[PDB]
């Protein structure tokens, strides 16, 4: 019941007690581990509120205070009357930071306490949402000196008045299916790119077209908005040794801003809560650029390097993968946009784990997601045992709004 | 209860029914996943169901389930258990058992080969010298002058746990490690503890960077004895790089035959505590882990210097760059010397096919993603994108404590 985790490179052992706080379920059982599976009312509401307020008031050293009981009382009365309740600004901020803190798949969590929270609960319209989102983007981008941020739209009520951002990220490239049978642009976004077209977007049908925003307010139908291009910071990708690399025509955007997740705090659900930090290089260089069902550029790059692609054993894919990832880091650094390599990031996370075990009693971590998609065992996290479990407040996945939406 | 796994690169969806035949525990609960944890004297009471379960499986596989020979065998085993407190496996059952233990090894990427396994029955063995002889033969057969053949040699099963056969080496062939007075380590740091034991037992260490360890063999619960594998049986490969001529001067080599000797083989409730087995290497085992783990030979820096990479910033990915060339060199050297080896692309691609085949013919394939995914270039291999389900089937290979921690010394 008190669990130990070992780092096999350093022999450092940490003891986990935080997992006993855990509430939600993992998908695993005594008979079967599902560690690699991608996706495993008033009476309900009050204990959830209570649990949250308990940890909030504990966090500020007023556990068992009059203010605690008063707030508990006040929220309790409000649930009985209104069937929901509203978070104080302080509670909202604490909740959002802690959702990030609890995100077991996030390697960047050492930054968790430095998050700018934008309260957009006064928003009533998609135009309003757009304004809030442009402000988020400009603030977080900060001319390339990225600052982590979250914008929080009104909470779910009866689920027929949901605020949703239909985009998966605020900034993403379109995907079009060709008559050639192939795919131009980002294959991951073909379906959404269609829905933008079905709703009226004029696609430029290019390789790297910034998608328009599809914004849903108060359960109404979604609307299109173009992010001012001046607010979309992008980085042309060159290699510091290969002059021909610039001719590949690649670029990426500086701001990773996930917009389709569900934020849960004290039993309350925020279905529209776009957040942003900054990239780890492998996200673009390894996954975005080299995944087969994505931009899939390995072959072309390999050819330009004139590698022996006859046999897999030449490790040409591995060679190319490295150089591509060099270029990404080099380009972002050269243009002064915040980015972190997989070595620096995983090393930070180890320090963060140690901080969390020391100061909190543990840290939930999904090894399958924390270990980078390249050079796994030369990063310290590979050798680090981790315990995965679900703490609240949390970020959760939710269905895509088109499968749900009653038009 | 049906269970679906998804490949997110191909959208291929597979349905697992095999997990229903699972008994052993994962270490996981509904409240916690221990998927990345490295490591999460039996009574006749608990022994017969295990025998029956095994024999039921065996006789199904040969399509004689419920036959008179099936029934008689259960009867025979039953009586032999209640008379002698244990039972002996037929040769056929032993072979079936060994192959299925490999087939069930969720952490093994090489399982496409599971049905090709040369089983050596060493259950008539009684002494350490006898173990040495069996092991020498295993090494010669499996090596086959570079054309490696998978094999396992199986020594007598545990009885009262006081007469265990154990091979004290973690692998039949492995390099010594020597801790120096200055804190540095000469040779393989992973083997410092075992090296020290050998030396204590009388081994005269050459004290070099690549000294092949002696065998330390324990028969029938007696104190272990030292033997030297004939050098002419130990196939080694000098590591050079196809374009970098200085790479040879690093002085690296490795042995050809990966042969794990410290695991426990469970078949029908019986425990085989000495069952060394061997296949062939995936390149990354040597080029990534053995050479590049900070706690192993740790050659990244010296290699990086020789390539003249920017080693001042990690964001140059000098480590990633040097890792690739080293792994190229390992593969190149083995292929050049015609010693069997497989790259991580080939191996993982084969595993996917094996896994799909297992789902179709067997109803599932238990697999440990954390272990199956190679330690470099993870997502450019197809296994990264494959959801897997991990669970325990018997027969199986299990870990067991190191014998020096448990052994009762005779003197
Ligand atoms: C500031 C620098 C940050 C870095 C370097 C970073 C790094 C990462 C990386 C590499 C992943 C894996 C994502 C993937 O492979 O698709 C991830 C996941 C995640 N991150 Fe972070 N992150 C940062 C900031 C943030 C912030 C500000 C939040 C929220 C407030 C956050 C919440 C999450 C969540 C919930 C996941 C899980 C993603 C999922 O389940 O789909 N991260 N992070
Ligand atoms: C024929 C070529 C083979 C290849 C390429 C191969 C590949 C591998 C690799 C790369 C690992 C991971 C080991 C590590 O990283 O420490 C592994 C694990 C394992 N293999 Fe295979 N293998 C082969 C044959 C065999 C055979 C013949 C057996 C037994 C009859 C076997 C049983 C196992 C078991 C039980 C593990 C788990 C290791 C552990 O838990 O420590 N493999 N294999
Ligand atoms: N199909 C699919 C499919 C693929 C990936 C994911 C998870 C994507 N998470 C992206 C994500 C989330 C948060 C992040 C925070 C920071 C950062 N640099 N990248 C981040 C990236 C889900 C479904
Ligand atoms: N400390 C430690 C520690 C390090 C490694 C392991 C597991 C090692 N597994 C080695 C292993 C086992 C079976 C194999 C089969 C074939 C092959 N090529 N390599 C194989 C390699 C456990 C504890
Ligand atoms: C099948 C497997 O769960 C899937 O490919 C996971 C593996 N680990 C990952 N890790 C990160 N960081 N991001 C991912 O998308 C994935 N995908
Ligand atoms: C802590 C973690 O489970 C440990 O480093 C594992 C990770 N995956 C592995 N995978 C393989 N094949 N071999 C290993 O030794 C390990 N080590
Ligand atoms: Zn699990």
Swiss-Prot record, chain A:
Tissue expression, as annotated, is: Isoform N-NOS-1 is expressed in brain and colorectum. Found in the Auerbach's plexus of the enteric nervous system. Isoform PNNOS is expressed in the penis, urethra, prostate, and skeletal muscle, and coexists with the cerebellar nnos in the pelvic plexus, bladder and liver, and is detectable in the cerebellum.
Which superkingdom does the taxonomy of this entry point to? Eukaryota
Q: How is it modified after translation?
A: Ubiquitinated; mediated by STUB1/CHIP in the presence of Hsp70 and Hsp40 (in vitro).
Q: Where in the cell is it found?
A: Cell membrane, Sarcolemma; Cell projection, Dendritic spine
Q: Where does heme b bind?
A: 106, 397
Specify which residues bind L-arginine according to the UniProt entry for this protein.
169, 278-279, 283
- Tell me what effect the entry lists for residue 279 to S: 30% decrease of nitric-oxide synthase activity
The residues that the entry says bind (6R)-L-erythro-5,6,7,8-tetrahydrobiopterin are 36, 368-369, 382
> Which protein family is named in the record?
Belongs to the NOS family.
Q: How does the record describe its quaternary structure?
A: Homodimer. Interacts with DLG4 (via N-terminal tandem pair of PDZ domains); the interaction possibly being prevented by the association between NOS1 and CAPON. Forms a ternary complex with CAPON and RASD1. Forms a ternary complex with CAPON and SYN1. Interacts with ZDHHC23. Interacts with NOSIP; which may impair its synaptic location. Interacts with HTR4. Interacts with SLC6A4. Interacts with VAC14.
Q: Domain comment, in the record's words?
A: The PDZ domain participates in protein-protein interaction, and is responsible for targeting nNos to synaptic membranes. Mediates interaction with VAC14.
Q: What does this protein do?
A: Produces nitric oxide (NO) which is a messenger molecule with diverse functions throughout the body. In the brain and peripheral nervous system, NO displays many properties of a neurotransmitter. Inhibitory transmitter for non-adrenergic and non-cholinergic nerves in the colorectum. Probably has nitrosylase activity and mediates cysteine S-nitrosylation of cytoplasmic target proteins such SRR. Inhibitory transmitter for non-adrenergic and non-cholinergic nerves in the colorectum.
Q: What is this protein called?
A: Nitric oxide synthase 1
What are the leading ranks of the lineage? Answer: Eukaryota, Metazoa, Chordata, Craniata, Vertebrata
The gene behind this protein is: Nos1
Query: In terms of the whole protein, what range is present?
Result: 299 to 716 of 1429
